[PDB]
Amino acid sequence: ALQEIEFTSHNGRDAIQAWAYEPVGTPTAVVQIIHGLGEHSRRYLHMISALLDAGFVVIADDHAGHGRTAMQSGVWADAGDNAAEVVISDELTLQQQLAGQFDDLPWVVFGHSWGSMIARAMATRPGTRLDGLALCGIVAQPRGFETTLDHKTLAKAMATAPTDPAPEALVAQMFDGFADRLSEDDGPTGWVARSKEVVADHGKDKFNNFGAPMSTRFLQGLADIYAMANGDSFYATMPNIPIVLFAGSEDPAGDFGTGVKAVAERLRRDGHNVELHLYDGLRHEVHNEPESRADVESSLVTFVDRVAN
Amino acid sequence: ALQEIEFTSHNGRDAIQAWAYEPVGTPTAVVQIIHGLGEHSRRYLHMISALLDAGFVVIADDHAGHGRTAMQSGVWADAGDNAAEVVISDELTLQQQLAGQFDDLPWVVFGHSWGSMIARAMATRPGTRLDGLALCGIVAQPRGFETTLDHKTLAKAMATAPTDPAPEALVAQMFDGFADRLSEDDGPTGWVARSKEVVADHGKDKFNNFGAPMSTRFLQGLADIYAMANGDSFYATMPNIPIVLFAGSEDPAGDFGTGVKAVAERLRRDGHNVELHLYDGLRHEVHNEPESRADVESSLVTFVDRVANR
Numbered sequence A: 001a002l003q004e005i006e007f008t009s010h011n012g013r014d015a016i017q018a019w020a021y022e023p024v025g026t027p028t029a030v031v032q033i034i035h036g037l038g039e040h041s042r043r044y045l046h047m048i049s050a051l052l053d054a055g056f057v058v059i060a061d062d063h064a065g066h067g068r069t070a071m072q073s074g075v076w077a078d079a080g081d082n083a084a085e086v087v088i089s090d091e092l093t094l095q096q097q098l099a100g101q102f103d104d105l106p107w108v109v110f111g112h113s114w115g116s117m118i119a120r121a122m123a124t125r126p127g128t129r130l131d132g133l134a135l136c137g138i139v140a141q142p143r144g145f146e147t148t149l150d151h152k153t154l155a156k157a158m159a160t161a162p163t164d165p166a167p168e169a170l171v172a173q174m175f176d177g178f179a180d181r182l183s184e185d186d187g188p189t190g191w192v193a194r195s196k197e198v199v200a201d202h203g204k205d206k207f208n209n210f211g212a213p214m215s216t217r218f219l220q221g222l223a224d225i226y227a228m229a230n231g232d233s234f235y236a237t238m239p240n241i242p243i244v245l246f247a248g249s250e251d252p253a254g255d256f257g258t259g260v261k262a263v264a265e266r267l268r269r270d271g272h273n274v275e276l277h278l279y280d281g282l283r284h285e286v287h288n289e290p291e292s293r294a295d296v297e298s299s300l301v302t303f304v305d306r307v308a309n
Numbered sequence B: 001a002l003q004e005i006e007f008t009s010h011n012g013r014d015a016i017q018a019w020a021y022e023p024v025g026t027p028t029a030v031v032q033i034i035h036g037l038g039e040h041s042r043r044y045l046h047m048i049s050a051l052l053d054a055g056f057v058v059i060a061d062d063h064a065g066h067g068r069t070a071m072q073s074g075v076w077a078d079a080g081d082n083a084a085e086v087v088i089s090d091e092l093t094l095q096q097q098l099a100g101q102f103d104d105l106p107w108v109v110f111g112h113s114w115g116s117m118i119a120r121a122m123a124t125r126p127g128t129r130l131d132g133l134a135l136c137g138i139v140a141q142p143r144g145f146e147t148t149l150d151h152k153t154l155a156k157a158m159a160t161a162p163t164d165p166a167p168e169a170l171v172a173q174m175f176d177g178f179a180d181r182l183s184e185d186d187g188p189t190g191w192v193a194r195s196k197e198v199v200a201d202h203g204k205d206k207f208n209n210f211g212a213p214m215s216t217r218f219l220q221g222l223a224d225i226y227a228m229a230n231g232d233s234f235y236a237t238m239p240n241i242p243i244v245l246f247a248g249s250e251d252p253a254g255d256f257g258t259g260v261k262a263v264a265e266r267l268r269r270d271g272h273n274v275e276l277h278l279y280d281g282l283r284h285e286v287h288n289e290p291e292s293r294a295d296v297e298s299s300l301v302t303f304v305d306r307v308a309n310r
């Protein structure tokens, strides 16, 4: 069974394109997929199918500035003012689109990259429906977000021209670390996957619209959600629910396994149960890399079957 | 990769809602999925994903009066005047939406039910891309379309109100035989599949729109496409390309396997390469029955891989 859900974004501009996929038979759980930067929810076709085969409802949308939402509105790589609050609020609104249909079922959030930061940010808001947390391509302690990004220069650019293309220097500062283990044969987006096939497909997918320039205010939104996701309030208010992490050891987003380990570690220090899957020699999109995809999907299915409150 | 490929129907009314799904890597074939009556192309999620894994581009549209195309036009279970020629044109147009992109790949057409009839009607037209034909839920020699449906009473209804819902008598007549092997427990849609879970999901899916009544002219369209699919000109003009058939023994659409067997034997009689998968104890949607899904899928992958060797 398929449902199309549209709603007005918290930004008042975008018609957020959303889908709910229901399996045949009586479902046991709801899985909300939150996609990352420069991609869309319908890229998760293999994983959506696998979660339906396992008897889960799947709900996902294309965020403000992305995929079919961008393709209908005409605005890529901008989510309007307060970018961070908009995509958080939008992911909460998506949950309420199933109110009364599945209130008895456990609800697992799966976030990738930017989706991981949104998920972590949602986990700390009262009234977020969340019985289990699954993060993929965790953004934790890469040099760019930690150190290189000059927040004064971003603040000044946010005061002069918040709707303009983000200055090139702030983009390159933000993603500093992402080319550290790539040769020239890899390319500028080689950190996306060891697999050149997945990287080329990432580039061609018209619903990724790769290259599309972020707005200043969008970049401030990346900095804001990065700070919410990795701040003391996250660690201290993360509810005691099952947590699973999926990362590639070569993924720069989690500082090549080190940043991901520190997330797990701090969560464990504060009494949380964290299941860490680290795929040795794989890059960012371990859910799409052909040597890891099956393990990410089979681990997430086992996770959901137990993380069923 | 995902392409959204909508185009204006031959009926001049509807915006045909279409998608192309491209796999990771160099694809080795294109598979066109053609869905049947009261269903939609995004119901093939499992098959689409299985074909992408196998390294094939998949293309499909929601036909006139169906799925997202009905949802955006507002018109359900009607495909315009000359319904058959509309849906046949729209599937040839669907192919042309990829022109320039995969011109040296082999093209398999997979049709289920109404889609199986459309696929056979396509096979007779020149300039149809078709290197292999795969048919599921085959509509061949069931009592309703063969003898029960009164073509005089249909001509009356077509002369009085082609746009109004088909009179109850013609709809009951067309599907006469579909209840012959259902207990009271199976219920009216029981023929869809042995699995109650599939039948219940079929009824619930909003993009299937369970109880939408056919127009008289849509019904004229089913009778017309049934005769193109099963008439002498189909058997006489079918190209010399691999053919695969998938049917349930308990599927009434193919006279409980008798009609599907008759399709195989008659194509063979003219020297055609035919591969026959009849699934004992299963009903219409053998591509959705839990017990046969995987086998219909891996047999389609094997078939396509075989077509590609040329």
Ligand SMILES: CCCCCCCC(O)O
Residues within 6 Å of the ligand: A036, A037, A038, A112, A113, A114, A115, A210, A211, A253
């Ligand atoms: C296509 C290039 C922009 C992608 C940034 C990476 C995605 C995760 O960081 O959200």
Ligand SMILES: CCCCCCC(O)O
Residues within 6 Å of the ligand: B036, B037, B038, B112, B113, B114, B115, B139
């Ligand atoms: C008439 C019920 C909907 C499914 C019909 C069968 C096939 O002819 O597509």
